[PDB]
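User: Predict the complex.
Assistant: Input components as received:
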Amino acid sequence: RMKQIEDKLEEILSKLYHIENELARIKKLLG
Amino acid sequence: RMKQIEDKLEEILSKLYHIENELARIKKLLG
Amino acid sequence: RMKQIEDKLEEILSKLYHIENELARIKKLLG
Amino acid sequence: RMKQIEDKLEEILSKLYHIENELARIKKLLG
């Protein structure tokens, strides 16, 4: 339950990693 | 006390899925 | 120590709320 | 698990702060 809990949070922690990658493109796209 | 925990998680999940495509959209909007 | 966890998932939850808005605003501001 | 969960949540906290911060900017540029 708990290891399943900390697993979803490693998940959440990566998508979040992806969104900054993307505000990283946007910035390009916008000068 | 605890189903709540994994219930808010699927929900934090769902959001980031929303955000996912919003950025997709934003990327598109921009190029 | 388990109400702690939840009250954080909520403060995460909420920031995911505002995030949705920044991007729907960014979204309109170009389209 | 206890320390470990609350080693990640506050890494997601921190991260929401900066993705949020990053969007403030996207605003100000965009108008």
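The radius of gyration of chain D is 14 Å.
Let me know if you want any component modeled separately.
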